[PDB]
Design a binder for this molecule. Sequence first.
Ligand code: SF4
Length: 299
Amino acid sequence: MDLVEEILRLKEERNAIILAHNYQLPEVQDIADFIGDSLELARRATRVDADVIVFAGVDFMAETAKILNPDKVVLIPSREATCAMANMLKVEHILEAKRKYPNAPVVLYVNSTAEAKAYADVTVTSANAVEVVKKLDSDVVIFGPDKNLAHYVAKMTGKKIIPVPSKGHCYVHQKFTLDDVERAKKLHPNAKLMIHPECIPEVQEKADIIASTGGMIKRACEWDEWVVFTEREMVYRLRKLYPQKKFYPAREDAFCIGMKAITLKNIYESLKDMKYKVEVPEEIARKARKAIERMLEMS
Ligand code: SF4
């Protein structure tokens, strides 16, 4: 079976769009209608004319698309496409922090459950966390789940950051070390380093640019050679966008298992079977939607 041909036909039959994250397998990126980071996928979720969304990404991302498109069918091809860091944050963490700091806005990374977003004042992604936190009317904000992004936000805004939970992090980005920075500079001495803010702070400090994957794409025009400190499928994405540049993985083994639960075959099966339908309870969705819409307004 020609999976690509079958998917193209089913997209037409289902009036479906495929939205893909930047960490998707190359063959999935190649059949997606739109590819982007967390923030771009959320905005693109607000101008969907199609009836069905196939979300080639992890669960919290498909949930966000469903919150913004409650009357469209949102399909996740595997329920094992999940984010380890997003599931570190529970409602009880948020409520405990709200108790200690009732006047602190609750700022939740989009890497969170819809249930957790129901208790947020505003959501953020890596691309807009600093701008959003800067503009909130408070010198202290509750922020999670990623402590490494928390550190970056604190450094850039000067505000006091109350992490929820205590040790939230992404195992993929925590793989990068100072030895990887030293190896990169030795193998590719003419390259600059683009580093995701989910990397540990001492690695962040070695960056030529700190950026979300979306900002990596935006700023890649500033140099012709880059070592890429994020999930390794980002190198494919950058190479396709800028064939005239050179991109090298900082670590080939920087692999997100949840992202790679999505396959060409189960995208085909997703459209064929109309599964797995993503649903968000109306009251959770209403409250999460308020925080997300406020994020999109605050840029
Ligand atoms: S890369 Fe890390 S933060 Fe992003 S989805 Fe995978 S586990 Fe979650």
